[PDB]
């Protein structure tokens, strides 16, 4: 709401949300952070879950 | 016995599989320690009770090092 | 009969034969979202001679 | 019988005390038995453990060590032939993470 990110339709803004990974006993926030785009429409047919790992890896880098 | 030897061979196989599993789960144990743990949960004991012990005992040997 | 099955596959878009006479092999499962990729499979024995492989893929 | 022997050996080895007349050994042994005779513990559910093994395998493929991930799934699949399995497994899980190796001396 503070920055320029808000300017888009509420559905795709809702579909972006934070996400955790497998936690460690020796945990920190820099160990575990991710963004999750939610696919619940028919659009899962065009984007599969193995390509989501790629976005995660590039975002991690 | 002969089948008891091949059984013992398979127990060496299982403790090596568990050694791979320990080394990429990157624990403080060596082979002989996890053998003792295998004895402990072969007779039936809590892993959540053993883990707190191993976790303070490894911290109670850096306390007087 | 063949051509009526063909127009059962263009103006209906659904395979309904209880016998194997058509070049499409419909699956009983109707999946969740992997439906589109996998439910329809080319039967390569009920390809007739007046229809090449290209035509069958295209109409499928 | 042999449980008490195993407890004494584990505390002697891991705590690195090779004297049984050390009072620190005795206090740690009393600590250990008081911990064992106490129970507040969530008795483990095997289904959660299976999901955890899957999640570790997923974290392996996310961080792109495919040989480690595939060997890990293959080893766990071979291991679960024929309860004691899950006990041992969850112990190994609980004891440490936050780092990962890459499996030297592997051709089988």
Curated annotation (Swiss-Prot), chain A:
Cell compartments where the protein resides: Cytoplasm, Cytoskeleton, Microtubule organizing center, Centrosome
Name of this chain's protein: Gamma-tubulin complex component 3
Tissues of expression: Ubiquitously expressed.
Organism name: Homo sapiens
Record's subunit section: Component of the gamma-tubulin ring complex (gTuRC) consisting of TUBGCP2, TUBGCP3, TUBGCP4, TUBGCP5 and TUBGCP6 and gamma-tubulin TUBG1 or TUBG2. TUBGCP2, TUBGCP3, TUBGCP4, TUBGCP5 and TUBGCP6 assemble in a 5:5:2:1:1 stoichiometry; each is associated with a gamma-tubulin, thereby arranging 14 gamma-tubulins in a helical manner. Gamma-tubulin at the first position is blocked by TUBGCP3 at the last position, allowing 13 protafilaments to grow into a microtubule.
Domain of life (superkingdom): Eukaryota
Known role: Component of the gamma-tubulin ring complex (gTuRC) which mediates microtubule nucleation. The gTuRC regulates the minus-end nucleation of alpha-beta tubulin heterodimers that grow into microtubule protafilaments, a critical step in centrosome duplication and spindle formation.
Family (UniProt): Belongs to the TUBGCP family.
Gene: TUBGCP3
The organism's taxonomic lineage, starting at the top: Eukaryota, Metazoa, Chordata, Craniata, Vertebrata
Curated annotation (Swiss-Prot), chain B:
Entry's transmembrane regions: none
Superkingdom: Eukaryota
Keywords linked to the UniProt accession: Acetylation, Cytoplasm, Cytoskeleton
Major place of residence: cytoplasm
Keyword Cytoplasm set for record: yes
Compartments where located: Cytoplasm, Cytoskeleton, Microtubule organizing center, Centrosome; Cytoplasm, Cytoskeleton, Spindle
GO biological process: gamma-tubulin complex localization; microtubule nucleation by interphase microtubule organizing center; mitotic spindle assembly
Any one GO CC term of the record: spindle
Quaternary structure and partners: Associates with the gamma-tubulin ring complex (gTuRC) consisting of TUBGCP2, TUBGCP3, TUBGCP4, TUBGCP5 and TUBGCP6 and gamma-tubulin TUBG1 or TUBG2; within the complex, interacts with TUBGCP3 and TUBGCP6 to form a luminal bridge with actin that stabilizes the initial structure during complex assembly. Interacts with TUBG1.
Function noted in UniProt: Required for the recruitment and the assembly of the gamma-tubulin ring complex (gTuRC) at the centrosome. The gTuRC regulates the minus-end nucleation of alpha-beta tubulin heterodimers that grow into microtubule protafilaments, a critical step in centrosome duplication and spindle formation.
Family, similarity comment: Belongs to the MOZART1 family.
Name of protein: Mitotic-spindle organizing protein 1
Natural source organism: Homo sapiens
Full-sequence range covered: 11 to 75 of 82
UniProtKB/Swiss-Prot annotation, chain D:
Full-sequence range covered: 13 to 130 of 1024
Subunit architecture: Component of the gamma-tubulin ring complex (gTuRC) consisting of TUBGCP2, TUBGCP3, TUBGCP4, TUBGCP5 and TUBGCP6 and gamma-tubulin TUBG1 or TUBG2. TUBGCP2, TUBGCP3, TUBGCP4, TUBGCP5 and TUBGCP6 assemble in a 5:5:2:1:1 stoichiometry; each is associated with a gamma-tubulin, thereby arranging 14 gamma-tubulins in a helical manner. Gamma-tubulin at the first position is blocked by TUBGCP3 at the last position, allowing 13 protafilaments to grow into a microtubule.
Function of the protein: Component of the gamma-tubulin ring complex (gTuRC) which mediates microtubule nucleation. The gTuRC regulates the minus-end nucleation of alpha-beta tubulin heterodimers that grow into microtubule protafilaments, a critical step in centrosome duplication and spindle formation.
Subcellular location: Cytoplasm, Cytoskeleton, Microtubule organizing center, Centrosome
Tissues expressing this chain: Widely expressed, with highest levels in heart and skeletal muscle and moderate levels in brain.
Protein name: Gamma-tubulin complex component 5
Similarity comment: Belongs to the TUBGCP family.
Organism: Homo sapiens (Human)
Leader peptide range in chain numbering: none
């Amino acid at each position: 709401r503070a920055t320029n990110a808000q300017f888009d339709s509420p559905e795709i803004l809702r579909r972006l949300d934070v996400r955790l990974l497998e936690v460690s006993p020796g945990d920190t926030g820099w160990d575990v952070f991710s963004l999750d785009y939610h696919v619940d429409g028919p659009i899962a047919t065009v984007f599969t879950r193995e390509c989501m790992s790629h976005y995660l890896r590039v975002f991690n880098f | 016995a002969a089948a008891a030897a091949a059984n013992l061979n398979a127990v060496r196989e299982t403790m090596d599989v568990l050694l791979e599993i320990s080394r990429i789960l990157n624990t403080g144990l060596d082979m002989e320690t996890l053998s003792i743990c295998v004895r402990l949960c072969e007779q039936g004991i809590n892993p959540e009770a053993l883990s707190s012990v191993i976790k303070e005992l490894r911290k109670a040997t850096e306390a007087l090092k | 009969p063949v051509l009526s099955f063909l127009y059962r596959w263009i103006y209906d878009g659904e395979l309904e034969d209880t016998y194997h006479e058509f070049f499409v092999a419909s699956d009983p499962t109707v999946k969740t979202d992997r439906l589109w990729h996998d439910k329809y499979t080319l039967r390569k024995s009920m390809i007739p001679s007046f229809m090449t492989m290209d035509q069958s893929r295209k109409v499928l | 019988a042999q449980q008490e022997r195993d407890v004494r050996e584990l505390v002697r080895g891991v705590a690195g005390l090779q004297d049984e007349a050390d009072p620190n050994f005795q206090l740690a042994l009393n600590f250990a038995w008081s911990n064992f005779r106490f129970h507040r513990f969530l008795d483990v559910n095997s289904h959660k453990i299976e999901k955890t093994i899957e999640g570790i395998y997923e974290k392996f493929v996310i961080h792109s060590d495919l040989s480690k991930a595939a060997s890990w799934k293959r080893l766990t699949e071979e291991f679960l032939n024929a309860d004691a399995h899950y006990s041992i497994l969850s112990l190994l899980l609980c004891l440490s993470d936050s780092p990962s190796n890459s499996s030297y001396v592997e051709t089988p």
